[PDB]
Design a protein around this nucleic acid. Structure first.
Lengths: 463, 88, 183
RNA sequence: AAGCUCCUUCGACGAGUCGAGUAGUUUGGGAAUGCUGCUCAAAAUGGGAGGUAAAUUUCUUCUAAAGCUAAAUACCGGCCA
RNA sequence: CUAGUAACGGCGAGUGAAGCGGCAACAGCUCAAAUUUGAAAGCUGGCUUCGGCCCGCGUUGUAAUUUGGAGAGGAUGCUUU
């Protein structure tokens, strides 16, 4: 079944046509028609099937059909575990509402609280949010959420894994329940996921299964290479690598889309040709770029690890993890298997600072063989002075460097493995020198006794 | 009494006319170290370093006029003692 | 820049730096004339927030005023007495404002920012040339400065019922028998 | 040169002043009604003023210590009518 | 008009407001707390053939931008002199 079969609005059909999507996966074809009918949806699809459109088409259709306005507040709320997933969904929603007069916005932990408060006060019809910041804005900021008709919970297994259980309990308690359609998605099925589906969804769900049963998570047939490099030289090493492994196939993973955009512009100026896949471009541009990379003899493509999680990775010589991996288990097992390849074995290199070496101990516990890569100091192409002159003289590159630095710091702060990757152990001066700064720009890393005679409160109203 | 549909209001920029700003906190902390202490603040700090918190609170209340101002001053001087010990 | 730090320092007047500086200055001012021209403000943050500009036509004048009662208390503030004495010495200037700079056992020292209304640098500036109008002749004598506004009770509210528009005008309004034509 | 919109960026707001004690003066007004003199002397999700027996000070409403400004108002004096 | 009400008082003499409501008239603004910092861009005087030349003030801050029911910076596309 194709997208023209359902009687969508002409604005939504035109937007999907511009994306280039004419055929659906199983999860879209099996979720969009029941969700347009008003039924709550329980899903079992993984990241990369196309679940984003599967929960964004009914929300956009509801917002357009009820004629929502910015004075009406939030109509649909999409809760995501991490900030980069929220930004990917925000890019998809920006592409989807190209012709829709409805507003869309993102609320993520680590951004400006006052600017987000003003954005919510002005009116955001589709709100893609992170649980802690969403709860903070729901509790302490004045904005309209009384006309809520759609609550999408995406990737609930990861959110329950990070520790947002009580946050989602208060979120479901706060949010209105009458005439609200709930769509919850999770790649696994645990007891906490069942509890969340019980408190959130109505008594009658619809359980849809799009998942491969032959997951090859074997812990022996693998080999993960790593290189220990200090922060202030990290990019330089990558640049040297990306100039020495020319005439080869390299995939590079970054933590954020903003750093991908910054390094794309940076490598354009520093005469190293690359290809970029970040969520600020058209979906058509991204598909054409990935198709061109898939049918090339050489070249390097830089993208986000969560952006290429749902991507058919071709045969490449090198898979480089420049930034800390968002999902270390998934990274090691699945990305090492896609790095080894169907034919002659490629290699999966991981960039480690000399403060995250405990990851190696984790690789000792999982019984995964490791390979250490060293590099001579004299073979690093030193372009640091040119980089600093470029950052100091170019206003657009300075802005991109600041955005990439902030995105890297915030993604490092919101990390599942906080023991291996701790922001407090990071030297901000050195990593900003890696981004090309003489001084590190200002960022927020974080973002007894009871009273005498005090008995617990039993009455009164606090707002 | 009468039933009307209450609106959600725009956030007032006059709200919190004190300081949640980090720069004013930085300036306040730097000036404290540079300027030094008042004689009564030094007496309160020498009582707090000896563990005589009750006398310190009474002295602060007597020389400030309010129990809340005394509490705030005693917490500020205890914080100064804590960072002075940390630097020591 | 630096004026924020000076404002925070001025808010700790018994700290060691400010106490030392206040005592040394008090000694010097005590041995000077009662009303003497000050080359520059000793408290630039305070003068700047009161409207002093480093421009030709602006003058600082330090003045000492004997402190204490007049048990009849003088209903006039010591700061008002300072502005009046300076305004008579500089009868060609307009008193803009004044502020406390020091206090001793027998005197309280104040600095008065004055403005020359005949200087062309003041007459051409739309931010200050309101003082060039003849309705602002001797503002300190009619209770039109900050101390005058405070002592006349010119505030909004139920606490200032009899003084918010002028005490004597309110008394004359309340004590007037209004007889209309058709009674 | 200017207005608006948007936001993965920011947002500095007045101190010998508030306030406490005390002596006068003033007001219909001890939340001292206001002012002044003396002694002590602040704060930063702060401060001021109110509402409320309602279960603890819940809530409400404004930003002091810098400044300008026509009209409606007064008028035994000035130029006239 | 409230209202000779509230409130205060050898609670005697008495003293004595204000919010709301109707009307007359209506008008809003300027600074300080920011680094112009890729350029003191600001101003008083004197000399003039009046067109532009000197000394000085000022960086311990003169212009522009901003004044918290705000604002700034980027981006953005219309609309204004």
């Amino acid at each position: 079944q194709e997208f023209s079969e359902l009687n969508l609005s002409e604005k939504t059909t035109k937007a999907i046509a511009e994306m280039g999507f004419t055929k659906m996966t199983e999860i879209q074809r099996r979720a969009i028609p029941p969700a347009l009918a008003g039924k709550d949806v329980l899903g079992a699809a993984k990241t990369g099937s196309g679940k984003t459109l599967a929960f964004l088409i009914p929300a956009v259709e509801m917002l357009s059909s009820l004629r929502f306005k910015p004075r009406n507040g939030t109509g649909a709320i999409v809760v995501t575990p991490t900030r980069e997933l929220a930004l990917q969904i925000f890019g998809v929603a920006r592409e989807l509402m190209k012709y829709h007069s409805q507003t869309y916005g993102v609320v993520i932990g680590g951004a400006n609280r006052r600017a987000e408060a003003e954005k919510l006060g002005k009116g955001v019809n589709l709100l893609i949010a992170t649980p802690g910041r969403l709860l903070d804005h729901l509790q302490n900021t004045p904005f309209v959420f009384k006309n809520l008709k759609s609550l999408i919970i995406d990737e609930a297994d990861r959110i329950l894994e990070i520790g947002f259980e009580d946050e989602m309990r208060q979120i479901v308690k706060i949010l209105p329940k009458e005439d609200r359609q709930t769509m919850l998605f999770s790649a696994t099925q645990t007891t906490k996921v069942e509890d969340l589906a019980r408190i959130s969804l109505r008594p009658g769900p619809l359980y849809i299964n799009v998942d491969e049963e032959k997951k090859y998570s074997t812990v022996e047939g693998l080999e993960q290479g790593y290189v220990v490099v200090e922060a202030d030289k990290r990019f330089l090493l990558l640049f040297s690598f990306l100039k020495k492994m020319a005439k080869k196939k390299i995939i590079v993973f970054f933590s954020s889309c903003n750093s991908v955009k910054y390094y794309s512009e940076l490598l354009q100026y520093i005469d190293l040709p690359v290809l970029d896949l970040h969520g600020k471009q058209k979906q058509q541009k991204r598909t054409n770029t990935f198709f061109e990379f898939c049918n090339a003899k050489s070249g390097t493509l830089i993208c986000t690890d969560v952006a290429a999680r749902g991507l058919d990775i071709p045969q490449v010589d090198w898979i480089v993890q420049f930034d800390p991996p968002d999902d270390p288990r998934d990274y090691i097992h699945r990305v090492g298997r896609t790095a080894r390849g169907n034919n002659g074995k490629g290699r999966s290199l991981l960039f480690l600072q000399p403060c995250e070496l405990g990851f190696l101990a984790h690789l000792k516990a999982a019984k995964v063989p490791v390979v250490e890569y060293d590099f001579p100091k004299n073979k690093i192409l030193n372009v640091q002075s040119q980089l600093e002159k470029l950052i100091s003289t170019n206003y657009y590159l300075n802005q991109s460097a600041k955005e990439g630095y902030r995105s890297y710091i915030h993604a490092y702060a919101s990390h599942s493995l906080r023991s291996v990757f701790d922001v407090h152990k990071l030297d901000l001066v050195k990593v900003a020198k890696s981004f090309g700064f003489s001084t590190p720009p200002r960022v927020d890393i974080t973002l007894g006794r009871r009273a005498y005679g005090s008995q617990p409160r039993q009455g009164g109203r606090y707002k | 009494g009468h039933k009307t549909t209450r609106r959600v209001l725009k956030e007032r920029p006059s709200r919190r006319k004190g300081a949640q700003s980090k720069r004013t906190q930085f300036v306040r902390s730097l000036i404290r170290e540079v300027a030094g202490l008042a004689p009564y603040e030094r007496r309160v700090i020498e009582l707090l370093r000896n563990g005589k918190d009750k006398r310190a609170r009474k002295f602060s209340k007597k020389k400030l006029g309010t129990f809340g101002r005394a509490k705030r001053k005693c917490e500020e001087l205890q914080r100064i003692i804590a960072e002075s010990r940390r630097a020591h | 820049g630096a004026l924020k730090y000076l404002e925070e320092l001025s808010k700790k007047k018994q700290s060691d730096v400010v106490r030392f500086l206040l005592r040394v200055r008090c000694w010097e001012y005590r041995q000077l004339n009662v009303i003497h021209r000050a080359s520059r403000p000793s408290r630039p943050d305070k003068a700047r927030r009161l409207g002093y500009k480093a421009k030709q036509g602006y003058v600082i004048y330090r003045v000492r005023v004997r402190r204490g009662g007049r048990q009849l208390k003088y209903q006039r503030s010591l700061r008002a007495t300072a502005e009046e004495r300076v305004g008579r010495r500089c009868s060609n200037l307009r008193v803009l404002n004044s502020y406390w700079v020091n206090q001793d056992s027998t005197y309280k020292y104040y600095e008065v920012i004055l403005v020359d209304p005949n200087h062309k640098a003041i007459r051409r500036d739309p931010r200050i040339n309101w003082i060039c109008n003849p309705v602002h002749k001797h503002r300190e004598c009619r209770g039109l400065t900050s101390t005058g506004k405070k002592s006349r009770g010119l505030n909004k509210g139920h606490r200032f019922n009899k003084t918010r528009a002028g005490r004597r005008k309110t008394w004359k309004r309340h004590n007037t028998l209004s007889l209309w034509r058709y009674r």
